[PDB]
Each structure stands twice: as structure tokens, then as C-alpha cells.
Enzyme design. Sequence first.
Site, PDB file in Angstrom:
ATOM      1  N   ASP A   1       0.810  -1.224   0.000  1.00 41.12           N
ATOM      2  CA  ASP A   1       0.000   0.000   0.000  1.00 41.12           C
ATOM      3  C   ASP A   1       0.838   1.266   0.000  1.00 41.12           C
ATOM      4  O   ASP A   1       1.343   1.703   1.045  1.00 41.12           O
ATOM      5  CB  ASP A   1      -0.946   0.028   1.216  1.00 41.12           C
ATOM      6  CG  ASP A   1      -1.904   1.177   1.162  1.00 41.12           C
ATOM      7  OD1 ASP A   1      -1.986   1.779   0.075  1.00 41.12           O
ATOM      8  OD2 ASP A   1      -2.559   1.493   2.193  1.00 41.12           O
TER       9      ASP A   1
ATOM     10  N   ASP B   1      -1.563   5.503  -5.620  1.00 43.99           N
ATOM     11  CA  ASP B   1      -2.113   4.683  -4.534  1.00 43.99           C
ATOM     12  C   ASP B   1      -2.370   3.224  -4.964  1.00 43.99           C
ATOM     13  O   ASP B   1      -3.380   2.917  -5.585  1.00 43.99           O
ATOM     14  CB  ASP B   1      -3.407   5.303  -4.031  1.00 43.99           C
ATOM     15  CG  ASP B   1      -3.949   4.589  -2.793  1.00 43.99           C
ATOM     16  OD1 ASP B   1      -3.268   3.655  -2.312  1.00 43.99           O
ATOM     17  OD2 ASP B   1      -5.034   4.977  -2.301  1.00 43.99           O
TER      18      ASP B   1
END
Length: 377
Positions: free
Chosen positions: A34, A220
Site C-alpha cells: 500500500d 495509490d
Amino acid sequence: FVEMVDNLRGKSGQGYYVEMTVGSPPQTLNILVDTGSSNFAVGAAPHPFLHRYYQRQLSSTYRDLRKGVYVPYTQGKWEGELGTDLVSIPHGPNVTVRANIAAITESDKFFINGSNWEGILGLAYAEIARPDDSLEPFFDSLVKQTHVPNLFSLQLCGAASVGGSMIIGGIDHSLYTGSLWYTPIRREWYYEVIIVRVEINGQDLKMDCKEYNYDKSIVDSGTTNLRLPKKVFEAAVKSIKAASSTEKFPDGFWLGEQLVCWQAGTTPWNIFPVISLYLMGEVTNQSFRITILPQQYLRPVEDVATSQDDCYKFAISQSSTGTVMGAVIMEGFYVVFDRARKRIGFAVSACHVHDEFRTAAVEGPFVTLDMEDCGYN
Ligand SMILES: Nc1ncccc1NCc1cccc(-c2cccnc2)c1
């Protein structure tokens, strides 16, 4: 880096994870990769969705920091106990570092029922770490304690099972074609970038470029879609509809709530436009562009029982928190998070999906003035 190639796995829509080991003797876990967060946090209790969890008391090297953490989301949260322990990545570099680990003891709407990961590896910066920026993120520890260069790169592929590579400490030439172009990381919190122009089939969307980054733009890996600010989303949807006028689709399709289906093999790819995002380059007044084919934003939808069509949902959605370049985008490109030099590289991915006639591209230079004014303050 051949040891690192193909070291990520996932399921469609549930993220990419990498195997890690924590503790002594080593406990093997699958950890979501992430770039949109900065804590390394692992299930540490038998939540029923989990295949595995961290057992701190079995690790001779665990150290309790005697400090709790609480990370809220809009509806969910996770909470846990801070500590440090020894950490390795089996299909990463040949090193072992002492990292902060949040041991997740209670959570709501964090873990995914059906997934094969049990924690999160937050790869973004300290500034957005919880409880505060003094909790050193994993990669910062890796770099501080070893000679691994301060960069990693991601090739996200996938399709249902997905695959990819996290190349830690370097760039692997085999994972991309054409050239690598770099955009500055505007600020070290998220991987914040500045988009300076947007075209659809080569035609400018004609918005004040500040709209593109209102109130930020980020890369992201922990979001699936291309997410666009409301005003940018509506213009882009309007323009995609026009390009594809030839057919009509339900309102709900443009909202991600409805599928669109064609007889197998007959999807009219030609009527959906290429999207070009221009990013601020490394040199004053210079930009470059990344080109998104429609097979990136028209997402195949698994199995509607007894239907032998090709069915798709729209993988562009609206944001109220700025532009998010999620897996949809990242899967078209090899993406280099060059932290040492505060910049993010893009090149066409060696595993991008082809269109019959059109070619994805990362191209430049272009001349774009006043690119700093595109950034939101
Ligand atoms: N990076 C990121 N962006 C948006 C929302 C959440 C987020 N990270 C935390 C997180 C927590 C739980 C699941 C996921 C997730 C779900 C599906 C796909 N990828 C990541 C992300």
C-alpha cells in the site's frame, strides 16, 4: 532482481500482497502493498476472515513499545499494540531489519472476507503514519539499517488471481518498454504528484489544471480505480460518452453500479477513448504524458452465472479527496518510487494489456507553463 520478479499475488479487486516474515523463529504472512499509507500493521488475533496472524508472544525478538494505536476510517478502523520485531521479505533483498509493527488486536471493516492477506505494508512517508510521524515506516527502517537503495518499483499485472513484481532497491529493465519519465513527488506524505493537463483522444478537457489536483493527486496501490475530483469526473464522463455515442448505456454504468455486456469477442474497444494525463516533469516548464487505453478503465466482471458475454464495469469513479491513480492506472505502467530523488517514474509496463490498434505510451517532453499553479494550496 530475478529473485523479486513475480513476488506479488492477489485476487481481482482485493489488492496485491507480498510475502513477509516476522519474528524469531520467522512467521510467514501475506501483506498488502500500500503506497497510500505508512504503517506496517498485521492481524495479531484470530479474526475469522484471516488465514494466518502474527503471534507476538512466540517471537523471541518481539519488543513491546507499550503504546497503542487507533486508525479510523470513514466507517471502519483498526487498533492495536505497537512493537518492534525482526522482518524479512523472502522474495526481496537478502536482509533482515528491525521494524515497527502494529499488532492488530481489534478491527472493523478492515480485513476482506475471502482475501489471502493478513496485514498491510504502508510504503508512504512518516508524515501520515499513526499515531504520529515519529513512528518510523518500514521502508525508512530498511534503508536506514541496510545498504538497500532508497527506492522500490512496482509492476502490477493480473488477469481471478493477479500477479506482479515489487522490485525493492532498484529498477528491472525487463519489466518495461520504451522510456522511463519522472514526475516530482510534491511533498513526502502520500506519493503526491501534480497533473498539469488531461486529454481524451488527444483533445484537451480544458479545465484549470488546479481542478486535476483539487485537493491533491496521489499514486495509490491500495485503491483499485482511477478516482477523479467531482468536476473532473463529470467532464471526463461527458467526453467518454460522446466518444462512444454510437451505443447508449444506463446512468448506473457510469456510477460503477451496472455492467455493460457484449457478445463474447465483440467489445467495441475502438469507440472508447484513450486518456492522457500530463504530469509535471523534472525540468522547469517541461511535462510528459502517460496514456491510458480503455482496457484499463473498462474492467471485466467475473461471472454472472449463465452469461457468455463479455461484461464490464466502469473503473473510473469520483473522488472528493483529489485524484487517485489506483491499480487501474498502475497496471498500465511500471512505476518507480524513487524516494532518494523525490520522484516517481512511469514507463509502459511489459505486462500491459494490448489493444488491437492503439498503443499505450509514456511520452515527452511537452512545454507546460506555470505548472506549480496546478498544485492545490
Ligand atoms: N491506500 C488506501 N486507499 C484508499 C483506501 C484505503 C487504503 N489503504 C488501507 C486499506 C485497508 C483495507 C483494505 C484496503 C484495500 C482494499 C481493496 C484493495 N486494495 C486495498 C486498503
